[PDB]
Design a protein around this ligand. Structure first.
Ligand SMILES: [Mg+2]
Ligand SMILES: [Mg+2]
Ligand SMILES: [Mg+2]
Ligand SMILES: [Mg+2]
Ligand SMILES: [Mg+2]
Ligand SMILES: [Mg+2]
Ligand SMILES: [Mg+2]
Ligand SMILES: [Mg+2]
Ligand SMILES: [Mg+2]
Ligand SMILES: [Mg+2]
Ligand SMILES: [Mg+2]
Ligand SMILES: [Mg+2]
Ligand SMILES: [Mg+2]
Ligand SMILES: [Mg+2]
Ligand SMILES: [Mg+2]
Ligand SMILES: [Mg+2]
Ligand SMILES: [Mg+2]
Ligand SMILES: [Mg+2]
Ligand SMILES: [Mg+2]
Ligand SMILES: [Mg+2]
Ligand SMILES: [Mg+2]
Ligand SMILES: [Mg+2]
Ligand SMILES: [Mg+2]
Ligand SMILES: [Mg+2]
Ligand SMILES: [Mg+2]
Ligand SMILES: [Mg+2]
Ligand SMILES: [Mg+2]
Ligand SMILES: [Mg+2]
Ligand SMILES: [Mg+2]
Ligand SMILES: [Mg+2]
Ligand SMILES: [Mg+2]
Ligand SMILES: [Mg+2]
Ligand SMILES: [Mg+2]
Ligand SMILES: [Mg+2]
Ligand SMILES: [Mg+2]
Ligand SMILES: [Mg+2]
Ligand SMILES: [Mg+2]
Ligand SMILES: [Mg+2]
Ligand SMILES: [Mg+2]
Ligand SMILES: [Mg+2]
Ligand SMILES: [Mg+2]
Ligand SMILES: [Mg+2]
Ligand SMILES: [Mg+2]
Ligand SMILES: [Zn+2]
Lengths: 53, 97, 137
RNA sequence: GGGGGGAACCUGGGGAACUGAAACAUCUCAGUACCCAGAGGAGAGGAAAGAGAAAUCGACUCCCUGAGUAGCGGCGAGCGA
RNA sequence: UGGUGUUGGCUCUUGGUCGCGCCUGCGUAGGAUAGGUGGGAGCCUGUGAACCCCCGCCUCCGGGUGGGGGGGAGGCGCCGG
RNA sequence: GGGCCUGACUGCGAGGCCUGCAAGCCGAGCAGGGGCGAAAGCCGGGCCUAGUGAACCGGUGGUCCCGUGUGGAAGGGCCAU
RNA sequence: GCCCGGAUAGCUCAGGGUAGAGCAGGGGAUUGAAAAUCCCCGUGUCCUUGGUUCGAUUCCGAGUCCGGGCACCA
């Protein structure tokens, strides 16, 4: 990473649990990430939100 | 500084501990001792002068036991104390502790 | 202040807190003006004035009230205060405490979700031209 | 009445370093060596403002066990009920 | 070098802050010194109005404001521009 | 180059490469819930091989496993980072 | 990591009703010149967005960036 390529987590947006960690380049991508992603807690796919690591 | 004439308190030995780091309760990695060393802690010795049977009698006393000196004078009432040199009066007073 | 008011002042005493019932028995003793005075209930919400979200506003349909039926609208002012008419000096005492209490209830029902302090920092009962009495809400 | 002496043993007051950590500072060596005071034939301790989970035990001391357990620890070296 | 003990008496000047009393708040249109709002068609006066005199005074200089001497029947609002 | 999308999955993992240890690497297949495709199928990031750092100590989010007589709490474990 | 903070025109700057001030630039006066002086003029979502108020750089929330402060680093 760097200061601009940054690490982050992905919180399931139904149960609010952080299920995945990844990285983005916050210049290239100021938008907080949204990714459908499978939540083991909910056991279904779910939209997940970028949430600070 | 020596010894409480009333209470017997005398200097104890203590360590001076020197720590760094941030306490764990504060989210810190923890405290680290950077030095331990012996030092002494002294009693708060002070002088208390009193007149008793017309003689001046002074005590070396822990500040904490200053009033116990006065109690002591107060109990010196029912005492035949005349003629006495200051040394032997004091003797008589601590005989009441 | 006028003799008429200076009089009433005696039947009060600031220190004392009073009770919803004790205050209801005084109201009548405090309404010495030539008309059916009201009563009013002044609070003092312990929330932040300059804001929103934590703004106290709404209505209450008092079981008796007004007599001028119910549904009074109340809204906290720029300061931390909120005021409202609870009835007219007439009303049997055991009729006001029913509204004072019914109104104060609504206030609590409209407390925010993000408010610091004891909310009802203070509460008072009064009449149009009379003095006032603190109360244990 | 004290005073001084006694091989070790004992209790109190004070109290190291080499060394170990394959460097070192916390830690270890160790409350050890040693210095001092005081006992005695022993000394200390001792009749619960205790233990600590059993609606339990019943002063203190000493041995065996519990146990290298429980824990303590630059969670290292080690320490240790 | 700060706090605190040993450490006491008398004054004078003060700030923080709890309470209560009480005034201070002036863009522009305007009776003119508009704090925010809710209440309120009446209330201030024999517990003495209207101006008159000393003024604690505050001021954006127009005024607000408060004790008392003169004081013995009219002032201040809904109106509504 | 374009369309749809988030498999830059969760739970595992036969079997190997490499190797003093610890590591490193490749992996078919099964289950869950998906994407794209008519389908056969493909997808557990990126043509490949560098872009990294054991443990200890501590942060944060979950979990609700322990909780020093009991209920709680303090603190800790476990999953994630 | 947490706490205090500044952002206003080209540079520097003070500020619930508002938008200006110093010298830089330009025009004019003056001068032998360089200045100094003097008169006019510009050069603004008052960092961003969202919210109060009738409205606001002014109050508040949220952001972004530099400024400062304290602490910690297995
Ligand atoms: Mg990942
Ligand atoms: Mg990326
Ligand atoms: Mg997924
Ligand atoms: Mg799970
Ligand atoms: Mg110290
Ligand atoms: Mg430590
Ligand atoms: Mg004391
Ligand atoms: Mg001897
Ligand atoms: Mg001897
Ligand atoms: Mg000893
Ligand atoms: Mg010794
Ligand atoms: Mg020495
Ligand atoms: Mg050493
Ligand atoms: Mg050494
Ligand atoms: Mg060594
Ligand atoms: Mg060595
Ligand atoms: Mg060396
Ligand atoms: Mg030791
Ligand atoms: Mg024997
Ligand atoms: Mg014996
Ligand atoms: Mg004994
Ligand atoms: Mg006994
Ligand atoms: Mg050790
Ligand atoms: Mg030891
Ligand atoms: Mg000092
Ligand atoms: Mg002092
Ligand atoms: Mg494509
Ligand atoms: Mg294998
Ligand atoms: Mg191997
Ligand atoms: Mg599948
Ligand atoms: Mg499929
Ligand atoms: Mg399909
Ligand atoms: Mg298929
Ligand atoms: Mg596969
Ligand atoms: Mg270590
Ligand atoms: Mg840890
Ligand atoms: Mg449990
Ligand atoms: Mg439990
Ligand atoms: Mg307990
Ligand atoms: Mg318990
Ligand atoms: Mg309980
Ligand atoms: Mg917990
Ligand atoms: Mg936890
Ligand atoms: Zn979920």
């Amino acid at each position: 990473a760097s200061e601009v390529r940054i690490k982050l987590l992905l919180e399931c947006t139904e149960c609010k649990r952080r299920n995945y960690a990844t990285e983005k380049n916050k210049r290239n991508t100021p938008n907080k990430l949204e990714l459908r992603k499978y939540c083991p807690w909910c056991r279904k796919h779910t939209v997940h939100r970028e949430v600070k690591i | 500084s020596k010894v409480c004439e009333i209470s017997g308190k005398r200097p104890i030995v203590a360590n001076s501990i020197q720590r760094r780091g941030k306490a764990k309760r504060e989210g810190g990695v923890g405290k680290k001792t950077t030095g331990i060393s012996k030092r002494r802690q002294y009693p708060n010795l002070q002088k208390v002068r009193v007149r008793v049977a017309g003689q001046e009698i002074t005590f070396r006393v822990a500040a904490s036991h200053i009033p116990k000196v006065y109690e002591l004078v107060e109990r010196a009432k029912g005492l035949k104390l005349e003629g006495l040199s200051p040394k032997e009066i004091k003797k008589e007073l601590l005989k009441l502790l | 202040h006028g003799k008429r008011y200076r009089a009433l002042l005696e039947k009060v005493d600031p220190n004392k807190v009073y009770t919803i019932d004790e205050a209801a028995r005084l109201v009548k003793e405090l309404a010495t003006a030539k008309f059916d005075e009201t009563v009013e209930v002044h609070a003092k919400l312990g929330i932040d004035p300059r804001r929103s979200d934590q703004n106290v506003r709404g209505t209450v349909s008092l079981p008796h009230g007004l007599g001028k039926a119910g549904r009074i609208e109340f809204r906290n002012d720029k300061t931390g205060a909120i005021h409202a008419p609870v009835g007219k000096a007439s009303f049997p005492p055991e009729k006001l405490a029913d509204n004072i209490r019914a109104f104060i209830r609504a206030l609590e029902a409209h407390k925010p979700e993000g408010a610091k302090g004891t909310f009802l920092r203070s509460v008072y009962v009064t009449t149009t031209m009379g003095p006032s009495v603190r109360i244990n809400p």
